């Protein structure tokens, strides 16, 4: 068929003949262009082309020659001239540039124009309300209905277009209309079971987003649908034009794209272990380009695979290798020419689009693995103004949904996975004043308590201040959450459940850690009106003794009482108790006798347990720091692994030492043991072994600064 290609005018017709049917797409992927040309050429991910199976005239070479010849372009009739312009502007959008033999420096562009990508939820809500015009506009809306979570009318709209598609004689829409019916059906089936099985335990109720009758319809339509034969049923005319689009039927479209990451990650992992150097495009830029070759296809053309977990896998591992490659390239050695080869680097500047990439498709745990290996703080952040508009956008959307009574759970299904990682990675950026205002108002009040307990809200809110200050405006917002918490501490069964154990006192402590002389005003007002009869509020109030008026503190003097081990620790948590009276020591020993009575009882019962917040760990710490010199304490040796290491360096066994304590210890405490002569040598060895054998960088840092 291609053995009659000899004429210059016919060449333009030939490329017109095969490439034109793909104009109905907003874009088609670069490397896949080999399918359209029957493996005639090979399209590299950079866009340039090398002869693959051509036994005749290189019709692609001629078009590139015509690109640089302004005179020859004038040797075409107005028709054929227009035929080239359609092909030409198609060749600049698609990232193809020029011939490989003539390839010099190529600076490809990257742009994802999909509104769904940019977190522009609100403008999209107006777009759907507009009247439909064209058949393609219907498909675009059939996507936007899904991204918001409205999986109900998205299917109903999808059934509408498929009936309306053929009348206009459009082929591309009909094929991509049916796939989004099966995949969204798959999104429907796994949610209903997910709601029933664990969702009943998750939200406390059997909320229903889908009407019972509608579920019966969808199963009937797609029951015997096998997605393998779908491309084999479309007619011959369709099967000749869009043979590139065939992969999207079966699930091979993410299998052909993940293996070429796995073989590629093998080389990048291999290359970081050799000290090798690579010229031109490194192995890593192929991953970055392929990620950005991929982000366009599934978002410009409005496919619904953007929420399935298989694609969340793919962005997970592509950036993970690149952030790895940004860590290793920041630290290695050379003789003379190592910098002479590519004497610069992108430094993996992480641009505005790169922040959408990880904020969306990661989970709170997955980021934490990356944080250990690759020091994200050392990587530079770009476009610190666009990145605000996404954060303020997300915070804006949180207030709309939950301040208003309406929360449509299918929206909450997707929206919360992205929203978490959005505000975890907000630390590394230098935020603006309005963003630090709105976001903190967003995280404290309306953001759900379930998904973010009162405990971990410290780990995020405090996390943002590492690279950001604490202005007066933000100080006003945080102090307000206490006022709400004061109207909350009249419950009869509240306990402030948490997986972190820092409570509403500690947020106020965060203010004072920056603004020490910030005596609270309203928390004083709540104290004075309260009386002794109702005293649940004491526990929070005395815990937030840090901030109060002098008379309000003097109110706490006659008010409140101290009789136990939490009063001692919570009172010592603020440093109010500067020393221990003999009465206080008697309370301490009273605790110990009970535990020893417990220790013998369980041992006689052959039972071993670990106390979670065992202060016996601290009781040993007091003696070692000269806090308490009581000689009666030696009667409780031998029950706790942590306790014994402190009391008796002369008669303590180092086989039971756990290497995790020397992490969890204060700057002053580690020094005193570092100064002690008895255990310095035996502490050194077990520490020495683990740095040599293991890769916990924190053990490495501790050993040099203090013990050396």
């Amino acid at each position: 068929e291609n053995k009659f290609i000899t004429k210059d005018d016919e060449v333009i017709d030939y490329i017109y003949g095969k490439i034109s049917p793909l104009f109905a797409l907003q874009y088609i992927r670069k490397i896949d262009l080999k399918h359209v040309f029957e493996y005639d050429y090979h399209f590299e991910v950079n866009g340039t082309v090398v002869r693959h199976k051509n036994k005749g005239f290189g019709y692609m070479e001629r078009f590139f020659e015509l690109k640089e010849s302004c005179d020859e372009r004038s040797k075409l009739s107005k028709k054929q001239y227009e035929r080239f312009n359609a092909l030409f502007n198609f060749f600049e959008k698609n990232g193809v540039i020029c011939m490989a033999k003539d390839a010099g420096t190529l600076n490809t562009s990257i742009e994802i124009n999909s509104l769904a990508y940019h977190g522009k939820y609100d403008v999209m809500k107006k777009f759907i309300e507009e009247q439909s015009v064209s058949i393609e506009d219907d498909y675009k809306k059939a996507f936007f209905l899904a991204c918001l979570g409205r999986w109900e009318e998205s299917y109903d709209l999808y059934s509408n277009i498929i009936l309306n598609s053929i009348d206009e004689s459009n082929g591309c829409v009909y094929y991509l209309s049916q796939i989004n019916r099966y995949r969204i059906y798959q999104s429907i089936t796994q949610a209903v079971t997910q709601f029933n099985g664990l969702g009943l335990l998750t939200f406390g109720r059997h909320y229903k987003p889908f009407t019972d009758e509608f579920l019966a319809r969808i199963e009937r339509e797609m029951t015997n649908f096998n997605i393998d034969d779908l491309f084999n049923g479309m007619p011959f005319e369709f099967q000749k034009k869009y043979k590139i689009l065939e992969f999207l039927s079966d699930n091979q479209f993410l299998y052909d794209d993940t293996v070429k990451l796995f073989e590629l990650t093998n080389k990048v992992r291999s290359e970081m272990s050799e000290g090798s150097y690579s010229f031109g495009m490194s192995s890593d830029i192929v991953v970055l380009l392929r990620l950005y070759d991929n982000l366009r296809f599934l978002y410009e053309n409005c496919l619904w695979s953007v929420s399935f977990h298989e694609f969340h896998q793919y962005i997970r591992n592509s950036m993970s290798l690149l952030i790895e490659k940004a860590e290793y390239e920041r630290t290695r050695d050379i003789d003379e020419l190592g910098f002479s080869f590519f004497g610069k680097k992108s430094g993996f500047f992480m641009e505005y689009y790169d922040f959408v990439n990880i904020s969306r498709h990661f989970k709170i745990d997955d980021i934490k693995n990356l944080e250990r290996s690759c020091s994200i703080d050392k990587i530079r952040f770009g476009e610190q103004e666009k990145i605000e508009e996404y954060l303020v956008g997300i915070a804006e959307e949180i207030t709309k949904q939950f301040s208003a009574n309406g929360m449509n759970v299918v929206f909450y299904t997707q929206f919360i996975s992205e929203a978490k990682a959005a505000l975890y990675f907000a630390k590394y950026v230098k935020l603006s004043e309005e963003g630090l205002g709105k976001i903190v108002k967003a995280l404290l009040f309306y953001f759900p308590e379930r998904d973010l307990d009162i405990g971990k809200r410290y780990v995020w809110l405090e996390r943002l201040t590492k690279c950001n200050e604490l202005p007066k405006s933000i100080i006003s917002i945080i102090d307000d959450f206490l006022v709400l918490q004061a109207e909350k501490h009249i419950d009869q069964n509240y306990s402030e459940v948490s997986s972190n154990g820092l409570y509403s006192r500690d947020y106020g402590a965060l203010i004072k850690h920056f603004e020490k002389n910030f005596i609270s005003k309203r928390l004083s007002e709540i104290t004075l009106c309260l009386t002794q009869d109702k005293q649940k509020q004491i526990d929070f109030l005395f815990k937030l003794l840090p901030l109060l008026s002098t008379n309000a503190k003097s109110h706490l003097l006659s008010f409140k009482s101290v009789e136990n081990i939490n009063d001692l620790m919570n009172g010592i948590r603020i440093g109010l108790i500067d020393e221990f009276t003999p009465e206080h020591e008697e309370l301490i020993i009273e605790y110990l006798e009970t535990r020893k009575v417990n220790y013998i009882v369980e041992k006689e019962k052959g039972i071993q347990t670990f106390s979670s917040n065992d202060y016996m760990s601290t009781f040993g710490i007091w003696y070692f720091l000269e806090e308490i010199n009581n000689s009666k304490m030696e009667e409780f040796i031998g029950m706790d692994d942590q306790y014994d290491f402190f009391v008796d360096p002369e008669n303590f066994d180092y086989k039971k030492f756990i290497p995790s304590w020397l992490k969890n210890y204060n700057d002053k405490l580690l020094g005193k043991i570092a100064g002690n002569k008895h255990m310095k040598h035996h502490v050194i060895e077990v520490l020495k072994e683990r740095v040599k054998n293991s890769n916990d960088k924190r053990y490495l840092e501790i050993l040099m600064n203090y013990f050396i």
């Binding site: 664990l198 977990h309 299904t413 997707q414 670990f610 204060n666």
Partner: protein, 151 residues
């Protein structure tokens, strides 16, 4: 017969305020993962601090099952905590005989399920469900163990 050897266990949830049982016959993935670290805190004033014991700490869990309980899952189909007990056994390496049962307990649980586990192919159930060591401010909690092998 040549080389491999495997094992099994038992998983047992429980909702407090009443004898609510929910369980899995197995914990296949069982991604039990402790952690202990510390980054920064304290104002460093007042001369003598007299203390410093915040251990933060974090816990997780995992389980496999398709057995959510036949009766009250559907009873509520048409928040009193989820305490779980991990029970198993340990054998003496010298004799390889089953002589000890290992018990694991948690005082107050909270399932934190990322409610977007939708995938692109029909999986063989395997609803990986994750819990978390949840604790009040009273005392104790976190974790405790029980041991047989009295012989």
């Amino acid at each position: 017969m040549k080389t491999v050897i495997q094992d099994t266990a038992d998983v047992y949830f429980k909702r407090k305020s009443d004898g609510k049982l929910v369980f899995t016959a197995e914990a296949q993935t069982a991604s039990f993962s402790q952690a202990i670290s510390e980054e920064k805190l304290r104002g460093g004033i007042g001369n003598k601090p007299l203390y410093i014991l915040k251990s933060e700490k974090e816990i997780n869990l995992t389980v496999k099952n398709a057995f959510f309980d036949l009766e009250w899952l559907a009873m509520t189909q048409g928040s009193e905590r989820y305490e779980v007990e991990y029970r198993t056994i340990a054998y003496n390496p010298d004799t390889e005989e089953v002589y000890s049962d290992i018990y694991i307990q948690f005082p107050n649980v909270s399932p934190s399920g990322e409610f977007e586990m939708s995938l692109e192919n029909g999986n063989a159930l395997a609803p990986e469900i994750k819990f978390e060591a949840l604790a009040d401010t009273d005392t104790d909690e976190m974790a405790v163990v029980i041991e047989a092998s009295r012989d």
